[PDB]
Design a protein around this ligand. Sequence first.
Ligand SMILES: */C=C\C1=C(C)C(=O)N/C1=C\C1=NC(=C\c2[nH]c(/C=C3/NC(=O)C(C=C)=C3C)c(C)c2CCC(=O)O)/C(CCC(=O)O)=C1C
Length: 600
Amino acid sequence: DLDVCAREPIHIPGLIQPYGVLLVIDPADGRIVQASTTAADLLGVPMAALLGMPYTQVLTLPEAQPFAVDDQPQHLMHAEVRFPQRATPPASAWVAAWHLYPQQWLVEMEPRDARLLDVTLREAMPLLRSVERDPGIAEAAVRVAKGLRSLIGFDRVMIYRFDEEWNGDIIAEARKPELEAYLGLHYPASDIPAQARALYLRNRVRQIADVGYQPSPIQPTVHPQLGTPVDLSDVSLRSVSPVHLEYLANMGVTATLVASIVVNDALWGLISCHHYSPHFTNHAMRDVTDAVARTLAGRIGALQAVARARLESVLLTVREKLITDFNDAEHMTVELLDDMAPDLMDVVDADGVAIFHGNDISRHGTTPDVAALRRIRDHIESEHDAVGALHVDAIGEVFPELADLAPLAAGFIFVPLMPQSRSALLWTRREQIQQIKWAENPQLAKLEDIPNSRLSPRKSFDLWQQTVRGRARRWSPLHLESARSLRVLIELMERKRFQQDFTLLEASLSRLGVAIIERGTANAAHRLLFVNTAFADVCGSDVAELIGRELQTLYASDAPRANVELLQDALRNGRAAYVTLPLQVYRQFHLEPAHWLLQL
Ligand SMILES: */C=C\C1=C(C)C(=O)N/C1=C\C1=NC(=C\c2[nH]c(/C=C3/NC(=O)C(C=C)=C3C)c(C)c2CCC(=O)O)/C(CCC(=O)O)=C1C
């Protein structure tokens, strides 16, 4: 309640959802040791008589049987269950699922079907086949929400995406026109506790048939000879926290079906179905919903793989241009930087870029004012894994003097392009509040609170807005690396500008393994000043991906060693080392001396 519920043990509630029946069985004699209150009317045997009876006397299993487990628990899927002690058979056919653990057996039973018609895999396959051919995550998510709304009959279907902090974003939505649109709403991580999140990942599909259900207590409560509560981590009939029930009741929601979106074994988000009237989702439709979630997750991870590859090639194109369009000599490395500005932003997913050249500042995306850009660099200057670049995700938390610049520079990446020079580069990101899709849902601004409520979508949207205030989406170590490797390449080219300029590079490029190595002037390290195509072919990396790299980064192969110190003493003094060692494959390293001429 209020705060303590963040660490509520929602897996041992001692209650179940009354639409089904649960039994706890002793795996050696088959005696029922514990049972839900709903077991007495279903099996037709009084609760007192039932507790201490073998399951074979009260229920019949024509299909799969329970078997003793030793190591990993086994879970038998839902199959036909009959009741021999009933005076009359039940109105609906019942189905049973087994959760077999080494010392305990759990049998959860529910009706085979709803008062609705069953949707099969065959009816779902066009949706599945379509989701697989969708061009974007947004298209795929919208298609699912609409699809799952038609297949299963839900009033609302929403797609959530979790951020790194586990905050939720309603990226897609499908609903009855009359319903309030929550698309574009974000909620804080605290709204779904870590155990709730863990169970959704574990369960795959989780339902709430009737929010206003009368909880069915597990009786006797604690195991008669072990004294432990029933762990319902795998039981789908598991009761829901009275906090969540209060949330849904305020909303008018009477049923929910939540399915996991698991991308690369991790929880990416969820599919949440909300009904405004009771809705039992049978085992067959739950299996279909599961198959729909797997397909959407499959597509996301595919579109996320294509996206990485796209970015990697864009990054390599800006590196290729930085080396080739610098060799013009009479063209500033800050001038072509201004032309590349949209690609510069893409490489680190920046909302804007500011190119510094003394007092001259050139803004490109969504960046603060020139006076605010001056303030940022000037405050950084006065302050004077391993990346040679300053970055922040919340400007006011690190530099409270610049706190008022959080709307357009909540997060930034600062790289001085020569610390000797007043030339630099500032990538910016706006605060998370700025990114709210008001356009995609004009009703969001107009979204009002539930009066008399302790919990609501309005309260949750406010809480999130409060938590992410003055903070940008965090910079990935990937995006962080790209910026340091750009600063390395820019400064290397800016050092190449005044350190022995020659036509020898053009003569070395023409001929066939060949690379020029800069000494580095007793600091940072010895880098690849220039490289040839054959050198990149033997290495495996690209000509622009290899220029700027370290000499130690070449033989990133740990296995050789032996020498290393013999190569380092020729680097630390400026002499020659004709020692052969492998790279990424065994090749000969022929170093010859300000700059070294290496070939392999
Ligand atoms: C003490 C912790 C909790 C607070 C605070 C609270 O508000 N709920 C808490 C506990 C649980 N939440 C669970 C699931 C859940 N909650 C939400 C919250 C929302 N924020 C929004 O803006 C909206 C809608 C616009 C909602 C619905 C959400 C999205 C979820 C995921 C499930 C769903 O979408 O229906 C749970 C798990 C309950 C269970 O047993 O299934 C707990 C315990």
